[PDB]
Ligand binder design. Structure first.
Ligand SMILES: O=C(O)[C@@H](O)[C@H](O)[C@H](O)COP(=O)(O)O
Ligand SMILES: O=C(O)[C@@H](O)[C@H](O)[C@H](O)COP(=O)(O)O
Lengths: 556, 556
């Protein structure tokens, strides 16, 4: 694999072998009262600041220099230029990778095969803006002349989680918007309990499918159409209540949606990078097209930061490189994303998909097997809740877990004269300080003595209350979670994932495990019909099917 | 530490080093027509069957036998008896561990400090049952004589996630119950956006706090009480709209809750094991006290299964030992929990707390540092959505991830004559089969040839479409997700976590990192008031605070 053969990588590994034991955060901060200034970026977007404080990481100036030299050696900048210039860097599928075109507010030409994509991007954005104005205003009416009160996105994966996470994050911007619902799971619970709360006369369905063939989405869409037509009877009424976000007009027409109700996107829009496209229509309906443009504008700002900033001060590049340090030298399997913001409750889940589906790969560009770690397991829940739960393992377990802590300075709900937000901020700050510092035997002993503990009881309990610390964090602090700032933060992590992929020499933009998934069930689905026991698979698959057939009509 | 000293553990590690190459699932199933029959448990609860199929694990007869011998050598059965007999096995805090007493439907005496706890357990259950009848029937009136339409649980961690996960899982059983809301985060978004949707005349607040001192919960409770008092303008009305779930009568009265409105629990009820106690009041209110009793009964059945079953066919013990095998021989950092059930969308999050807060430890019973791995990072999302996202990494990444796949045979919503649930079952089966089998270069070449790809397209795609497989899974299939079956499944994992803790010789039942977290914010809280620069901490803590002070009245 290219990475293990890279001389900057070998130099990094050799340094780690010799100097690893010098990396003690308490000692590094005590020796350098300017450590924060040396290891932090502040970005002024003109619509809020982003502080990326990476000073609580197990790095020194020499480590950061070697990491930046690795990014140069691995051709990060040349790879970046290929992406932005519309070259087919999705080399397995032979596609461009142009989510950056979707939010290209400058309208600088971006050529695929010598043809500018921006006229087509802007045509779909115009169509979305006109449709959002009509639905939100009440101009667009249901089949009995009522205004739309409820918008239901039907889609899965990349056609589901981005719009869900963004509408959750920007809920305060939704006044005067229809309610938004996300139906994704084939589990009939999902559509059933959603439809039970809706009126067909005032419900608009958005069938979100790049291919328009995904079994979960097409099955959910047929169930919603059956429910709708049971009320409306007239197949003509479907053109007022179903629209499609797709690449395929033929499949859309075959399903029964007027192709005029199709909002188009392109092969070079990956599902997990698609919320910036027509896939974002549920966002624009919920918070208005103006706020959707602000979301694209923030992503565009961070695209420019990524493109023009020297590597050593480049936010997504440095987040990527800290990740490489922890994955490929320390051997950490996981990365925790811990936003101190209830509106961002689906933010970690969104990057669980964006990161793991991108860089969960083992075959390099030359078709050779990697001989090193690739993408980590991404997980997390919002603070402060995690502090009462899994933070126990982060503080006192046997695993090293790099954590990203994120928080807005200004809250959308400054209740009780900002008392809640002050407590939230203090916890955000105090947790990363404790993870870094820990607590020595002597500090814990002196606190137990002050608490009034007996001499044995104290020496019993003492070692259990000792924290080794040295647990590294990034703190990412931003003025306020506005549509623009959310756009910038999402795009920052997209480019972090892109940089890690280039360094690992994998294709961040295909998903052959997900493409396989979509063909796995077809062999077993017909075998589940009838009482007859199944013998066509391995013993376990067969046993599980036969148990399902047995329990199918058990009464409990 | 005890485990690395244990001769059965050393024998297990010896075997791993030498026979690791035997462990090929494709080969194990081809050689053993009875592998499913030999490596699965079928449990008849008399209220549904549970099939625990562990046959797609990297184990043989010899491994399972050596694992059961380790459980005997580490004293699992003696530790189990100490828990159930009310001995103070929470040795750092000096407390019993008696969640099993909360659901002891047999009413067999359990003595703590020589007194039966069961009278007190059953007194609170009678009080809960009496209150739930009054609220749900409409007998219990708000301060303007209206029936309660909305119940708001206020609490964090163990006082939040259990009731939240259970009310989400048992949502079909809440017909005729009030709506339930969970406010947990200090983030003022959480209480603010909840209160905006409530009528104070018909809203009952539940203040859930073991200690009744937790800053998030007490701050949220005060905010709700202020909002309530602004509408009601009568301190007497508080007794109609606020109840407490706590161990601390003093602090409940001091807060202003009528001591008649207090539902008590005890020191030996761990927060992450508390949903079976008074903490479960919001469950009983939502789905009715009868369903809550069924939930306790299911747990009680699994408690008795755990207690009476020989180790080698004991469900929680075998799940625990498969975990030890992957954690302490294979070195897997993580455990994925993947329920194929939308109602279980918070089940992995619940055990993320339950597992990681229990076994995220590095200090043994003797007060010595472990020299081996302990608890894993637990994570997951419901199927089928994961198949479109992070399953890419499970199939083709560089990480080994033991996964538990869970599914009910019978759906709560058999829509389209069972078509959705048939697709869901087919996906659940096909995914674990594909993880085990993978797809060879030869098989992938044949599929591309058959698809009609040019030699150029074929040779470019071929190596990217290969799956090495050999990825182990548990399949846990149960008749139906009823209150009883949910209680059995939650208790099964509770006891898995207990067994792993005893084998590691750690205290599964303290949480000194969570207790530390509750003390951290108080030293930083005062520094945030006024706009003076802060210099009293490390450079990074100082840097972050100063940035917060700069941006907190920036206008964006
Ligand atoms: O990441 C992906 O590519 C997947 O999650 C897809 O977005 C998902 O399978 C849906 O595909 P489609 O939009 O073609 O229905
Ligand atoms: O696991 C724990 O102990 C915590 O998650 C607690 O449940 C949480 O801190 C709430 O404590 P209390 O119930 O004392 O408010």
């Amino acid at each position: 694999a290219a990475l293990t053969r890279d001389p900057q990588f070998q130099k990094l590994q050799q340094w780690y072998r010799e100097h690893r034991s010098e990396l003690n955060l308490r000692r590094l901060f005590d020796a350098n009262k300017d450590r924060f200034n040396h290891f932090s970026l502040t970005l002024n977007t003109n619509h809020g600041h982003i502080l990326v404080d990476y000073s609580k990481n197990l790095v020194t100036e020499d480590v950061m220099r070697m990491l930046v030299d690795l990014a140069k050696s691995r051709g990060v900048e040349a790879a970046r230029e290929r992406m932005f210039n519309g070259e087919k860097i999705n080399y397995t599928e032979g596609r461009a990778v142009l989510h950056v075109a979707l939010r290209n507010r400058s309208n600088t030409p971006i050529l695929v095969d010598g043809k500018d994509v921006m006229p087509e991007v802007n045509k779909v954005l115009d169509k979305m803006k006109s449709f959002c104005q009509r639905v939100r205003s009440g101009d667009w009416k249901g089949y009995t002349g009522k205004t739309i009160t409820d918008v239901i996105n039907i889609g899965i994966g990349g056609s589901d989680l981005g719009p869900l996470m963004v509408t959750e994050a920007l809920k305060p911007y939704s006044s005067g918007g229809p309610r938004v619902w996300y139906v994704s799971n084939i589990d009939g619970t999902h559509i059933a309990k959603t439809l039970a709360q809706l009126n067909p006369e005032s419900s608009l369905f958005i069938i979100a499918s790049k291919t328009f063939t995904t079994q979960e989405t097409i099955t959910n869409a047929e169930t919603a159409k059956e429910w709708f037509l049971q009320a409306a009877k007239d197949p003509s009424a479907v053109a007022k209540h179903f629209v499609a976000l797709s690449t395929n007009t033929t499949k859309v027409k075959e399903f029964g949606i007027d192709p005029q109700n199709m909002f188009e996107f392109w092969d070079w829009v990956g599902g997990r990078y698609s919320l910036w496209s027509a896939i974002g229509l549920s966002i624009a309906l919920h918070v208005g097209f103006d706020n959707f443009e602000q979301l694209l504008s923030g992503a565009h700002w961070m695209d420019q930061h990524f493109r023009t900033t020297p590597l050593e001060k480049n936010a997504p590049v440095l987040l990527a490189l800290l990740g490489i340090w922890y994955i490929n030298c320390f051997g950490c399997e996981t990365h925790a994303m811990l936003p101190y913001d209830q509106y961002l409750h689906r933010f970690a889940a969104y990057f669980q998909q964006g990161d793991m589906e991108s860089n969960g790969k083992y075959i390099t560009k030359s078709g050779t097997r990697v001989d090193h770690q690739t993408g980590p397991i991404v997980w997390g829940e919002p603070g402060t809740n995690g502090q009462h739960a899994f933070y126990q393992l982060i503080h006192q377990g046997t695993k090293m877990i790099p954590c990203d802590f994120l928080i807005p300075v200004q809250t959308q709900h400054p209740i009780r004269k900002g008392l809640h937000h002050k407590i939230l901020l203090a916890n955000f700050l105090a947790q990363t300080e404790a993870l870094m510092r820990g607590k020595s035997t002597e500090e814990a002993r002196k606190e137990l003595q002050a608490a009034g503990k007996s001499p044995e009881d104290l020496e019993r309990l003492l070692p259990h209350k000792v924290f080794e610390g040295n647990r590294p964090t990034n703190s990412i602090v931003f003025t306020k979670l506005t549509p623009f700032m959310l756009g910038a933060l999402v795009a920052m992590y997209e480019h972090k994932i892109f940089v890690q992929g280039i360094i690992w020499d994998i294709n961040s933009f295909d998903q052959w495990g997900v493409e396989l998934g979509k063909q796995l069930a077809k062999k077993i689905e017909p075998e589940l019909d009838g009482s007859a026991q199944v013998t066509s698979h391995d013993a376990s698959t067969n046993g599980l099917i036969n148990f399902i057939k047995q329990q199918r009509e058990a009464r409990v």
